Amino acid sequence: GYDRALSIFSPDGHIFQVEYALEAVKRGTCAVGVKGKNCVVLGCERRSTLKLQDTRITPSKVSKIDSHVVLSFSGLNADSRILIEKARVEAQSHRLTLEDPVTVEYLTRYVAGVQQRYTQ
Amino acid sequence: SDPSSINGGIVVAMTGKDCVAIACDLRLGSQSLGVSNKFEKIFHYGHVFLGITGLATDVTTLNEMFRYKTNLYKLKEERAIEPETFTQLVSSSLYERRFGPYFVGPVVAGINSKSGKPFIAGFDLIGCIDEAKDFIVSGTASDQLFGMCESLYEPNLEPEDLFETISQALLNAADRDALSGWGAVVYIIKKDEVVKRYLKMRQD
Amino acid sequence: TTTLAFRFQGGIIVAVDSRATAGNWVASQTVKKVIEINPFLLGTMAGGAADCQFWETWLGSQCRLHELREKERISVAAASKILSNLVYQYKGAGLSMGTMICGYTRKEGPTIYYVDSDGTRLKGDIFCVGSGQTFAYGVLDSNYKWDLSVEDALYLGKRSILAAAHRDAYSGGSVNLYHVTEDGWIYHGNHDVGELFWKVKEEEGSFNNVIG
Amino acid sequence: TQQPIVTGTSVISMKYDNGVIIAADNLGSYGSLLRFNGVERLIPVGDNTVVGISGDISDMQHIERLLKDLVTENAYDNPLADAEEALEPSYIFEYLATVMYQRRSKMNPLWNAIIVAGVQSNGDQFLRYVNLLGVTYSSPTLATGFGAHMANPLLRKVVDRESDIPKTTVQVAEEAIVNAMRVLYYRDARSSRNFSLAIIDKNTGLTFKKNLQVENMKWDFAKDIKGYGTQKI
Amino acid sequence: MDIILGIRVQDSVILASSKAVTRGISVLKDSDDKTRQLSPHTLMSFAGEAGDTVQFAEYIQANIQLYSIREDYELSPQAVSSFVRQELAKSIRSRRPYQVNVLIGGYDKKKNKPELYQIDYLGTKVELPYGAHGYSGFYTFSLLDHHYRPDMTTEEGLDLLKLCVQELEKRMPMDFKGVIVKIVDKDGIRQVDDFQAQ
Amino acid sequence: MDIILGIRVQDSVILASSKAVTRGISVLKDSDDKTRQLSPHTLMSFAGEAGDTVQFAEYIQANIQLYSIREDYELSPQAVSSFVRQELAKSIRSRRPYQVNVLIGGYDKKKNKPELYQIDYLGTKVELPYGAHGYSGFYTFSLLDHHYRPDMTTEEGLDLLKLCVQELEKRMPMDFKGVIVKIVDKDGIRQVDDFQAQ
Amino acid sequence: QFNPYGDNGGTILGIAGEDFAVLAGDTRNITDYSINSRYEPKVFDCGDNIVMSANGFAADGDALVKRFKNSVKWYHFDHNDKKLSINSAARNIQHLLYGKRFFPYYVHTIIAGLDEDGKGAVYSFDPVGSYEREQCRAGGAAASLIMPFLDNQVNFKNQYEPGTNGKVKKPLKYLSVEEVIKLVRDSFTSATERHIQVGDGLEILIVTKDGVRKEFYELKRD
Amino acid sequence: TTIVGVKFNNGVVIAADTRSTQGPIVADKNCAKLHRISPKIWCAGAGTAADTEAVTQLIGSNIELHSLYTSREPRVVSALQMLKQHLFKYQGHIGAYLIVAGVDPTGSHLFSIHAHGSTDVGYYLSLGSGSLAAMAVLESHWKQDLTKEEAIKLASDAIQAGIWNDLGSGSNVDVCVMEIGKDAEYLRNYLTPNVREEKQKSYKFPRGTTAVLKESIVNICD
Amino acid sequence: TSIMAVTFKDGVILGADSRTTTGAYIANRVTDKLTRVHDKIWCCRSGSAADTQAIADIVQYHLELYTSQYGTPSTETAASVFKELCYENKDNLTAGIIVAGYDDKNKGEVYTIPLGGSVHKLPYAIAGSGSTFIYGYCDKNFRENMSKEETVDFIKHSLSQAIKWDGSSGGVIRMVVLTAAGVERLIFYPDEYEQL
Amino acid sequence: TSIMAVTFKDGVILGADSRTTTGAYIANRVTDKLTRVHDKIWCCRSGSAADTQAIADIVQYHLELYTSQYGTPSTETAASVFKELCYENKDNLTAGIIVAGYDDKNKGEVYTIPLGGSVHKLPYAIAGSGSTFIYGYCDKNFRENMSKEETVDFIKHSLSQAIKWDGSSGGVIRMVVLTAAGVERLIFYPDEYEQL
Numbered sequence A: 001g002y003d004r005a006l007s008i009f010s011p012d013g014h015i016f017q018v019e020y021a022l023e024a025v026k027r028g029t030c031a032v033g034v035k036g037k038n039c040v041v042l043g044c045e046r047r048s049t050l051k052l053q054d055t056r057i058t059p060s061k062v063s064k065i066d067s068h069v070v071l072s073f074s075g076l077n078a079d080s081r082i083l084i085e086k087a088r089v090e091a092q093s094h095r096l097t098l099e100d101p102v103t104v105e106y107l108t109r110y111v112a113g114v115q116q117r118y119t120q
Numbered sequence B: 001s002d003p004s005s006i007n008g009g010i011v012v013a014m015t016g017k018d019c020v021a022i023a024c025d026l027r028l029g030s031q032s033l034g035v036s037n038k039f040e041k042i043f044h045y046g047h048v049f050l051g052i053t054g055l056a057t058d059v060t061t062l063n064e065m066f067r068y069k070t071n072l073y074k075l076k077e078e079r080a081i082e083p084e085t086f087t088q089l090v091s092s093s094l095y096e097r098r099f100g101p102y103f104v105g106p107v108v109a110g111i112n113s114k115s116g117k118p119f120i121a122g123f124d125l126i127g128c129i130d131e132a133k134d135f136i137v138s139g140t141a142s143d144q145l146f147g148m149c150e151s152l153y154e155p156n157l158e159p160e161d162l163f164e165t166i167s168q169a170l171l172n173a174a175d176r177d178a179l180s181g182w183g184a185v186v187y188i189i190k191k192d193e194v195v196k197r198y199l200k201m202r203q204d
Numbered sequence C: 001t002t003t004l005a006f007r008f009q010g011g012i013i014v015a016v017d018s019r020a021t022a023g024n025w026v027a028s029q030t031v032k033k034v035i036e037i038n039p040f041l042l043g044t045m046a047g048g049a050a051d052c053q054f055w056e057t058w059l060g061s062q063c064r065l066h067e068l069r070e071k072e073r074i075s076v077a078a079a080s081k082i083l084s085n086l087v088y089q090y091k092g093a094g095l096s097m098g099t100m101i102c103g104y105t106r107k108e109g110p111t112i113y114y115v116d117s118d119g120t121r122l123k124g125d126i127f128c129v130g131s132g133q134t135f136a137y138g139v140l141d142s143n144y145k146w147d148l149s150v151e152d153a154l155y156l157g158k159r160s161i162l163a164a165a166h167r168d169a170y171s172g173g174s175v176n177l178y179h180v181t182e183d184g185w186i187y188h189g190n191h192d193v194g195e196l197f198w199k200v201k202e203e204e205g206s207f208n209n210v211i212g
Numbered sequence D: 001t002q003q004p005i006v007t008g009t010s011v012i013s014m015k016y017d018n019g020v021i022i023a024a025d026n027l028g029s030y031g032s033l034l035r036f037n038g039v040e041r042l043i044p045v046g047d048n049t050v051v052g053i054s055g056d057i058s059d060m061q062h063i064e065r066l067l068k069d070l071v072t073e074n075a076y077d078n079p080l081a082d083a084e085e086a087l088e089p090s091y092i093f094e095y096l097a098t099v100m101y102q103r104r105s106k107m108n109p110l111w112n113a114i115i116v117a118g119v120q121s122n123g124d125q126f127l128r129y130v131n132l133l134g135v136t137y138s139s140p141t142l143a144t145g146f147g148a149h150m151a152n153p154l155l156r157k158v159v160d161r162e163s164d165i166p167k168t169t170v171q172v173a174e175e176a177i178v179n180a181m182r183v184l185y186y187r188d189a190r191s192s193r194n195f196s197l198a199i200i201d202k203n204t205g206l207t208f209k210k211n212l213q214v215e216n217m218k219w220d221f222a223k224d225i226k227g228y229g230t231q232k233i
Numbered sequence E, F: 001m002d003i004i005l006g007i008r009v010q011d012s013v014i015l016a017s018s019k020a021v022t023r024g025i026s027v028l029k030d031s032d033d034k035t036r037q038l039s040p041h042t043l044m045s046f047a048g049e050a051g052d053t054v055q056f057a058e059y060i061q062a063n064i065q066l067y068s069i070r071e072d073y074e075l076s077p078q079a080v081s082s083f084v085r086q087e088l089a090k091s092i093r094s095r096r097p098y099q100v101n102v103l104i105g106g107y108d109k110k111k112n113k114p115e116l117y118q119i120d121y122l123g124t125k126v127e128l129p130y131g132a133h134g135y136s137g138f139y140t141f142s143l144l145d146h147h148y149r150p151d152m153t154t155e156e157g158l159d160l161l162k163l164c165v166q167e168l169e170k171r172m173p174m175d176f177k178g179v180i181v182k183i184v185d186k187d188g189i190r191q192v193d194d195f196q197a198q
Numbered sequence G: 001q002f003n004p005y006g007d008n009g010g011t012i013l014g015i016a017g018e019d020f021a022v023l024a025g026d027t028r029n030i031t032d033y034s035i036n037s038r039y040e041p042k043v044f045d046c047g048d049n050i051v052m053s054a055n056g057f058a059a060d061g062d063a064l065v066k067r068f069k070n071s072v073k074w075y076h077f078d079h080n081d082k083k084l085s086i087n088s089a090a091r092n093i094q095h096l097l098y099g100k101r102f103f104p105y106y107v108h109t110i111i112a113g114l115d116e117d118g119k120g121a122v123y124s125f126d127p128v129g130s131y132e133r134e135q136c137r138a139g140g141a142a143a144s145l146i147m148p149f150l151d152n153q154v155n156f157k158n159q160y161e162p163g164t165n166g167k168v169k170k171p172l173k174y175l176s177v178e179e180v181i182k183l184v185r186d187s188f189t190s191a192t193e194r195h196i197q198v199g200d201g202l203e204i205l206i207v208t209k210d211g212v213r214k215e216f217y218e219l220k221r222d
Numbered sequence H: 001t002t003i004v005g006v007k008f009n010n011g012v013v014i015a016a017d018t019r020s021t022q023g024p025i026v027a028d029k030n031c032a033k034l035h036r037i038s039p040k041i042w043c044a045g046a047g048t049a050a051d052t053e054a055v056t057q058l059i060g061s062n063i064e065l066h067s068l069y070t071s072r073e074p075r076v077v078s079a080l081q082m083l084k085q086h087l088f089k090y091q092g093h094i095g096a097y098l099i100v101a102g103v104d105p106t107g108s109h110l111f112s113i114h115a116h117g118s119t120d121v122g123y124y125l126s127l128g129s130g131s132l133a134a135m136a137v138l139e140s141h142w143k144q145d146l147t148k149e150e151a152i153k154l155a156s157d158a159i160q161a162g163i164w165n166d167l168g169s170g171s172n173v174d175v176c177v178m179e180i181g182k183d184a185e186y187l188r189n190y191l192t193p194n195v196r197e198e199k200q201k202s203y204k205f206p207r208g209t210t211a212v213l214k215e216s217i218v219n220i221c222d
Numbered sequence I, J: 001t002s003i004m005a006v007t008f009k010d011g012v013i014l015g016a017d018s019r020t021t022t023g024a025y026i027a028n029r030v031t032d033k034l035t036r037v038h039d040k041i042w043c044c045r046s047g048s049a050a051d052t053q054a055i056a057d058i059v060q061y062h063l064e065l066y067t068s069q070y071g072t073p074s075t076e077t078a079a080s081v082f083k084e085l086c087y088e089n090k091d092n093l094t095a096g097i098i099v100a101g102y103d104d105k106n107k108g109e110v111y112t113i114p115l116g117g118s119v120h121k122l123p124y125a126i127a128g129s130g131s132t133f134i135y136g137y138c139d140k141n142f143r144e145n146m147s148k149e150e151t152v153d154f155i156k157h158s159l160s161q162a163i164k165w166d167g168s169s170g171g172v173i174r175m176v177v178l179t180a181a182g183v184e185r186l187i188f189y190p191d192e193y194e195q196l
């Protein structure tokens, strides 16, 4: 197929396409997380450009990856769905092979690896 | 499932100086399952010794047949059968069954009561006579026995030396075979006397 | 081959014979049927020598890889499932192996998994595996209690392999003995059946089908 | 899955003091039909090597093309192709053994038995065998097919071990080859009176004899043989 | 040979599965649970060739659990059974088919009805008031044809099942070491751990 | 495959024989006695091929009984067992061999010893402290190798068997429906008719 | 049908001393009832003080030896001339053999060298890569003839201390190179007498902390 | 086995090697394969050894009886005709392959017989696995009107070809010479070119090496 | 094997090569395939050597008994005995026989008994593995009433072709001439007939 | 099938019978077995009809492409294309082909490619089931450098014998003459060749 390189190095040492990817995150709605003593809370802001929405069916920003792990994001909404799907798949696969749900660190390492792969 | 392999067992015989020895293992198995630790495979009609390996039912049957025939022989000839003669009797009794043979490897050991010269012989299941003067081997460890004997044997061994050689041939051969072992008896045969010894061996 | 593993009050006994055969030929009497995967994990081998040696050594490699990746020792469950899943990929190609994966972890406790080349994987407290298994089972089952001392449990394991070495033409050689604890396998020696049989006969007054 | 169709019987060979001799008859059989009669099964490569081939003849013809291609290719960008970088018998052999073994390993053999004869560049005799299974061996005498059962015993009476080889002359060795060919013509139902023979010598080089015939056959004693037991006339 | 029975009463589906795992001349285990929960209101039991059995069940389990999380929703028993059938139907013409037969018992919340599906390794699916795989059906179908009623309670179903297990213990040549019994209704899946001497 | 066990204690011989008769997918009888009395002090147990089994046993029985009445005298266990053996050994080579394995337990009154003979359908004979035919020997031989003593009472022999049975009820794939136990001693043959719920 | 396998006869034997090892093999190559060669070696110096034989089907034996010699070459290239130790050679050969698990090499293989401590070492493989270190091993056609002799004459099995009523065993000593060569020669003259595939010549390879030494003895040619 | 028969001007000679085998294993290193049918009619067999022995003895028995009944010397063509008709009747199942030779009042005779019952007449013949190696020698050196010496040499060299080159043959050369003039001369171990070399070492065990469990004298008489 | 029998003016000639093979090995290179069952009744054998030798022997015995009771048997009579043996035991025989005989009333006659045990009276016949290669030749060159030397030539050429193409045929060519005169044995060597 | 090609003074002639059978049924009594793969290169086919037609078609394709690019192919080139196809596909082909051609330089040439895929250059060749019956006859009657009419006769006689004995051969005798002249088709009917 088409595998022409789009993400390459700048004279001063940055990968421009990754740097511009961070720009897309900057203009995405805000998301926050803080951890209590015995809990974690996830908060997200919904935009005000359009307000005739149906909240019943509009994909909300916090997603269950498994029954014990959650994921929120900021950036391209369509882009996030590819990550959430793969993470869900990986989580079932890990229950299948290691007979245990994933640790949060494991799931993170996994998503991060997918992101890294798409930079090279 | 090849009949000469169902039950397992070995018999070996050697000549020495004015003596002969015949030794056997004691195992009676049924394939992998060891069944009896006391199944002797050596027999004697007068001064004549017969060891038989192979299918156990045939080993018993053959013994009973040769007891029968050497009894009648003694009654008509008024003397005990000699090893040479018994050899021929074994041979032609086996050949009579050419197309439904007994599944056995018989071995003959004895001293000629008249000439005093040691005599051993082996047969295949249809009566073919192997006429070796040094040793004869038979059973499921026959390769190993041929190995031990060809290496360990020397002619003109005194009875007490021959006992060492044949025991060591048997024991080390039995130990490289899954179907043989589980006990051994050695017969030392001198004209005059016969000593029978049970050997101490690996019980696996 | 005879191999066994059982759980009791004080952990796990693992015991195996050391006989290798091809047909009726006795190939070796000194073969190693236990693999020390890591200090808390053991594998036992029955069936195809090569198949077993190769895939359990390989399992060791995959287990080490898990440690490096996850900064933690692999669970008994997961080590067994690696071997189970590999073997299952090969189903119908003629792999021949019966296997026990035995170990300790904090989260699981002492654990035994039986794994074979048909793809069966079971968790349990008692397994005997190989051509000698039924013999081992007879002795083991009739003298097994949960509360056996460590000393007795070691003896029973030792005594069950001896049972099988004696009756099964395809077992024998020596017993290799292992105790698996919290801390966690300890090797309790190699015991040649050559000597062990006579000694046990004498001291126990058993083996009465035996002349001598 | 394959089976030989057109075949050609023994190839026989020995070393003498200075070189090697190899021979093979000129027949290509079709089962029991003696089908073709001008078949050459001695293949000279360069002038220090002869390859003798038995078995399937279609495969033989394939191996001829391979050997010709090998000579072409060795000549390419090789200014020493007719001197120090000439093909040696051992290179030809190893190549063929490799092909033979790879083909059997793919379950698709070249259905042949092959003898490579020649003299190396240091004067050493070379004599080696490879067949459809990639089995290889070397010996002072070598033969394929019936030749193995009947020529070897005769040839071995002449060269029985290494130390016999400085002692054997061209004449003695060729005599033994020619005689063994006669015995094969007597007893092998797939053989032929016509054969080729090659001598590869450290001094003389390559002598390739064609259209040789088995001579001095004994048949007179046949007139006395009547019946199969009792019949008198 | 593995006993796998199912009976659908008025408000639940009951599954019973033999506990033995036998290889050759040895019973290796007498507490084997031939069951995977697919979703909180759907249970699957299985029997067939040695390795294929668990591999298939767990693979199906992984797939339904994936759907649940993706959709934050529980597939109906009818949907899970169709999904399962299709996997078996594909498998039957693949290089090495899964040799597994299954019972699927589910409680449907949209309809508020228990549902029992019998599917063999070929992908033959049927919805039944009661079912069995293997030889056990040769005894149990006729027993249940006689004793079964559409409006039985859960306790009546358990008696009816006790009757089937009795018949199998009396007539079947193999020792299957009792069954593990599981009930699937509106309040999910629970195990009746007292059946061996209930 | 029928369990056929024999243990020889000090003053007696005990035979234990399974009660099941199974054809195909059905257990047809759960109370079969796999035994024939050959004389007041000789009992025979048998297993093997469906018809051969009883026909051979009843044939041996008629022959021993005839001999008894003709000599007004009871043959020794050893003599009975040689007769049986030769019968099997002749049969093995005929047009359709008897496919029957046997245990012979008798009390020799002239010697005052109990005796146990094991003979397979080939005519392979052996005298043993304990014996078995078929699969069951793969369990019991090692068990008895361990727990057996040559000078046990009849009561201890019965406990030795209880173990043997227990082990077989744990590890054998098939339900053999318990055993019938019989003791042969100086008095004769009695049935310990209360072994299953004992 | 085409059968990819044959049988070239042939018997090989490995014994480990204290600071030496030997690998012996007969030099006869056979097919059915014919003799191919009376002198075709099948014990090889593989470099790094390792000797090897793969006996059975000679084409598979040759292929394996070639492949392993090549392993040794590439080991030097990729690991900066590191000596390939005997135990490492062994493990490697297991992967070579097991790599063909579903189309095996019809060989029984033996290697011999010195271990890390300079002790004599012998390793033996089944055709699919199962392996073990042993004090000695016979492989090939007459193996079943020679092994039990070795069990008795190298490891003193079944030999008790005279007079001890069989408790004290003959204590397991080490054998000199002279004593070892004696047993080898005797083992082979025995095998030549009783096995039709064994004869013609005996080649022995001796490995010490000074390299590899060769010895040759005529065997019976019948 | 290698057996030959060679006709010379005043008689016939037969020779055989002395090795019997059991698959690849040598059972008897010096067996006798030259059987007597009657004093001056001798016989060499290959194939099932029990069959060649038995068929030789049955026919020898009947030939003696015939000779007594007829008051004549037995004739080779009678051994032949009785052997062939017996073998034929057994449709190959009695696997005897024989070279039968002898002198009688009508002259010298050389025949072969195959297991199925066919016969052939010749001046020189060979049978068994070494058959081809033997025939190579016969076809190379046989000529009409051989002296007795030449024929013994030829026959013997032909067996030698078998011994060295055929794996099914070895050990020694037995000859039997039947001349029209005199008695048959059986020449046992005419050649013995395969003496086992002196062993490297004695394996005589120190007494008491073997552990004994129990001992007893065995009764012979009554 | 290559065998033939040819009737001519003065009687009949039988011819055969002399090769017997087991597989591709030549067991006998000088076999005599021309077999006497009576003074002037001879045959040629192909198929199993055991089978054809046993049969020839029984026929010979039968014809000797016949001569003793009733006078010389006719060639047809000999063919009938062969046929009875072949047909009745067809199931266990692999026997192809050519019978040829000289008689005064009847002159030369040829009968062929192929594998089934059927009988065919013919002017000449050919058989054995080698005979396939000479059908065309023999059909093109045979005439009735040939002279002795012509028939010897026709058989010499015919068999040499069969020998050239058949790996199972070879050796010398043997003939038997059967006329009033008597019985004459001929032999022709490779160096002779290969040129022809 | 009986098929042959014969070289003579001025070129080469191919001949064949015209019978194709499936078992004992004559599927076609007038088959044309003489197959053109170029103007003056023809072949005769034996073995599987499907296989040899498929091959002849491929060869014809290759020789047309060859002619477009490089000019008239030699007969050797033709033979080599057949061989390549037959050898490389020996495991799913039952094909025996005789190739015959004429050109100016090399004159008349014949190659036979039997079942193996081997190639043999020959003065003349015969093949097909019917050919076994004429080995002797053809070997006795063929000469080099015969005239056209002599060659036509040799094939005519040869194949009439082949037809006479082989049940698989029969019908008409077709021939193709190949010379500088030219390409000539000959046919001969039973009523003529049976009286030979």
Ligand SMILES: COc1ccc2c(c1)[C@H](CC(=O)N[C@H](C(=O)N[C@@H](CCc1ccccc1)C(=O)NCc1ccc(C)cc1)[C@@H](C)O)CC2=O
Pocket: C001, C019, C020, C021, C022, C023, C027, C031, C032, C033, C045, C046, C047, C048, C049, C050, C052, C053, C096, G104, G105, G106, G126, G127, G128, G130
């Ligand atoms: C081409 O030749 C072939 C091809 C394929 C194969 C073999 C040879 C092999 C020859 C071969 O048998 N090799 C032997 C072997 O595997 N023996 C088995 C029993 C036979 C067995 C049982 C079940 C399945 C396969 C083999 C054995 O002793 N198992 C116990 C044991 C367990 C663990 C360990 C570490 C060692 C021993 C070795 C010991 O020489 C079998 C095989 O796969």
Ligand SMILES: [Mg+2]
Pocket: B203, B204, C164, C165, C166, C167, C168, C169, C170, C171, C172
């Ligand atoms: Mg054991």
Ligand SMILES: [Mg+2]
Pocket: G083, G084, G085, G086, G087, G088
């Ligand atoms: Mg290293």
Ligand SMILES: [Mg+2]
Pocket: G191, G192, G193, G194, G195, G196, G197, G198, G199, G222
């Ligand atoms: Mg030898």
Ligand SMILES: [Mg+2]
Pocket: J162, J163, J164, J165, J166, J167, J168, J169, J170
């Ligand atoms: Mg026609």
